[PDB]
Amino acid sequence: GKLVIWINGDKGYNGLAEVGKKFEKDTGIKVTVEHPDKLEEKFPQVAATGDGPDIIFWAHDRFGGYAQSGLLAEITPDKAFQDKLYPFTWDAVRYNGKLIAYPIAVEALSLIYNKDLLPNPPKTWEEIPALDKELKAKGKSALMFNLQEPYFTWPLIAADGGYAFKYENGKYDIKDVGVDNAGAKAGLTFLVDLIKNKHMNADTDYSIAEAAFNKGETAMTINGPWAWSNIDTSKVNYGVTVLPTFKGQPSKPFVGVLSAGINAASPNKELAKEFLENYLLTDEGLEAVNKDKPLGAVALKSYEEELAKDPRIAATMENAQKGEIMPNIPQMSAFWYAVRTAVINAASGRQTVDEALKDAQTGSGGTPG
Amino acid sequence: SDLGRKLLEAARAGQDDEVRILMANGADVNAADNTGTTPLHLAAYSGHLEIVEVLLKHGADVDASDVFGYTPLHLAAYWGHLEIVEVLLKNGADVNAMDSDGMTPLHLAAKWGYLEIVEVLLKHGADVNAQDKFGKTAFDISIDNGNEDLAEILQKL
């Protein structure tokens, strides 16, 4: 009769702990909230039977591997509970058509812009070149974001058809990769052309983009809710909105879903289920943790509508809904390496778009075609 | 080297005086970085006429091409810097240089409907019939970008 919980140190574990406080005050179940570093890398080592936390909180992508080796219990929320969450969020916690965790929060990149420099941000990528020339004449830059990680450039590359692994009703076809198709090539070529024409620089990284935007040097950047606090400190008059479209199609950023999984070796699974569905996944539950540390957009429709009053959170949710859920399969690890290399080589002219993506396609475990 | 990067940066930022000091300290006018971008590319792109003149005077290669096949002239036409386009042409710039995709400076000026740059280019012998990788000419580029005006003019094929 004891529930142990593992959650990252950047989350609101104080608020979550406050949640287990009520559970313990209604059932007498001692709830413990810990946040050891490397917990995700440690869980599969400690949870491999013997003993580990009962409930682990982490981005859903890492849960695929856990389920692969049978480390997570299959949860079974009822049709009523399932309706309290946005449908797309259940798709992020599925492994082989089996629910393996509960959706908590949702994150995705958004377009961030300096309202003083740019009243109405561009609704399309195609408009950016013209916008940059207009701004360069006033000593300003149109757009500046981290071009070193495929996580940041994927939204554009995926827009016209690119995708990581094909997702079909609860499962991924691990051999059907979408980095080599006409859509991916169209997106990457548009990105390379921005570099080729000097609208962006291939060496721009996370720190450079961040500093440039917070110093009012660039009109826009692309980043997630984690960067918001620093922008508030810079006092830049900023807005957060939908990402621009490419060829009339929405940019598809990767969606990350903070989730809570149950240890398959946990002796008290009923308790864990009770805690999550009736104490945490509630308007008061989430609000308790959100107060200690903002969660961003939320999977629970109920609390999301309340949080969505903040236009930044509404943008986050709108971009996520148009995005691509990050595949939770083991293959993603090679995907990240392969694609990072392709964009960097394409951006510096070391490889052509075709060449670069052909290598990324096979490096990700897909077939050329 | 040391002065190499400095010169590129100064040329990009239009620091005319910094360029003066750097040249005096032995900086290579034809210093090219990772992507083959020379100080002349950066000054031609940023629109710094005085710096373009200085680099050319010191022997800057007027037709250096970067990894994408761009010469300083490509960047000057695309960015609408007419003065710099003229200076480059007078210093021997190849009016028909082609990038990796087969685009010439005329194609780039066409994308924006830069009439004056188009004229200076034609006068210097720009091949209006030149086709790029997508089998497109300057004319085809004008329609794709909706430059009806320039389009009607390039009608002299």
- Kindly report the CATH number assigned to the domain that includes residue B43: 1.25.40.20
3-state secondary structure chain A: CEEEEECCCCCCHHHHHHHHHHHHHHHCCEEEEECCCCHHHHHHHHCCCCCCCCEEEEEHHHHHHHHHCCCECCCCCCHHHHCCECHHHHHHHECCCCECCEEEEEECCEEEEECCCCCCCCCEHHHHHHHHHHHHCCCCEEECCCCCCHHHHHHHHHHCCCEEEEEECCEEEEEEEECCCHHHHHHHHHHHHHHHCCCCCCCCCHHHHHHHHHCCCEEEEEECHHHHHHHHHHCCCEEEECCCEECCECCCCEEEEEEEEEECCCCCHHHHHHHHHHHHCCHHHHHHHHHHCCCCEECEHHHHHHHCCCHHHHHHHHHHHHCEECCCCCCHHHHHHHHHHHHHHHHCCCCCHHHHHHHHHHHCCCCCC
A320 and A259 housed in the same domain: yes
Q: Which domain holds residue A88?
A: 1-107+254-327
| Closest CB from B35, B79, B112 relative to A349 | B35
With residue B14 as reference, give the H or E element that holds it.
none
Q: Is B124 helix (H, G, I), strand (E, B) or coil?
A: coil
Token pair in block for residue A115: 């309202």
| Cβ atoms of A357 and A345 closer than 8 Å | no
Distance, CA of A11 to CA of A23 (rounded, Å): 20
Same-domain check for residues A202 and A306: no
How many angstroms separate the CA atoms of B152 and B90, rounded? 28
Instruction: Pick the last residue of a domain from A327, A344, A361.
Output: A327
CB contacts, 8 Å: B45 with chain A: 198
Closest approach of chain A CAs to the CA of B35, in angstroms? 7
Residue with tokens 């086709």: B131
Same domain, A205 and A347: yes
Q: What is the resolution of this structure in A?
A: 2.2
Select from B45, B67, B112 the Cβ nearest to the Cβ of A198.
B45
**B141 — contact with chain A (CB < 8 Å)?**
no
Counted domains in chain A: 2
Q: Quick check: A66 and A74 in contact, CB under 8 A? A: no
My answer on whether A177 and A285 are in the same domain is no
Q: Is B43 on the interface with A (CB under 8 A)?
A: no
Identify whether residues A197 and A70 lie together within a single domain: no
- Mapped onto helix, strand or coil, the DSSP state of residue B50 is helix
Both A269 and A132 in one domain: the answer is no
Residue type, A208: I
A258 and A161 in one domain? no
Q: How far apart are CA B70 and CA B41, in angstroms?
A: 8
Residues of A with CB under 8 A from a CB of B: 133, 196-198, 202, 348-350
Grouping H, G, I as helix, E, B as strand and the rest as coil, residue B130 is: coil
Please provide residue A163's backbone torsions phi and psi, each rounded to the nearest 5 degrees: -160, 160
On whether both A174 and A228 belong to a single domain, the answer is yes
Question: If we measure between CA atoms, which residue out of A318, A176, A307, A166 comes closest to residue A241?
Answer: A318
Chain B residues within an 8 Å CB radius of A196: 68, 70
CA torsion sign for A207, A213, A217, A221 is positive
CATH number at residue A205: 3.40.190.10
Contact assignment for A196 to B35 by CB distance below 8 Å = no
Six-digit token pair at B127? Answer: 């091949």
CA angle in degrees (0–180, nearest 5) for A282-A283-A289: 85
Q: Rounded to whole angstroms, how far apart are CA atoms B106 and B96?
A: 8
Q: Is the dihedral of CA A283, A284, A285, A291 positive or negative?
A: positive
Given a contact cutoff of 8 angstroms between Cβ atoms, the answer to whether A343 and A191 are in contact is yes
Rounded to whole angstroms, the Cα distance separating B16 from A5 reads 62
Q: How far is CA A283 from CA A29, A85, A173, A305, B142, in A?
A: 22, 12, 36, 10, 56
Q: Which residue of B has its CA nearest to A345?
A: B35
Give yes or no: residues A8 and A100 share one domain. Answer: yes
Q: Is B78 in a helix, a strand, or coil? A: helix
* B25 phi and psi angles, rounded to 5 deg: -95, 20
Please give the residue range of the domain that contains residue B69: 1-157
Terminal alpha carbon distance of chain B: 47
d(C-alpha B45, C-alpha B35), whole Å: 15
Residues of B with CB below 8 A from A186's CB? none
Distances from the Cα of A229 to the Cα of A214, A285, A319, angstroms:
11, 23, 20
In this complex, do A196 and B34 lie within 8 Å of one another by their Cβ atoms?
no
Structural domain total, chain B: 1
Q: Cα(A296)–Cα(A11) distance, rounded to whole angstroms? A: 11
| Contact assessment for residue A320 and residue A142, using Cβ atoms and an 8 Å cutoff | no
Q: Which of B34, B68, B79 sits opposite A196 (nearest CB)?
A: B68
Structural method: X-ray
The answer to whether residues A83 and A41 belong to one domain is yes
Which helix (DSSP H) or strand (DSSP E) does residue B90 occupy?
A: helix B82-90
Tell me whether B78 touches chain A (CB under 8 Å): yes
Positive or negative: CA dihedral A88, A91, A97, A101:
negative
Q: Are A3 and A20 in contact (CB under 8 A)?
A: yes
d(CA A283, CA A281): 7
User: Hey, is the C-beta of B67 within 8 angstroms of any chain A C-beta?
Assistant: yes
At how many degrees (to 10) do helices B39-46 and B2-12 cross?
Answer: 10
Residue with tokens 């692309």: A222
CA dihedral (A187, A135, A215, B9) in degrees, to 10, reads 80
Residue B55, phi then psi, degrees to nearest 5:
-65, -40
Same domain, A271 and A225: no
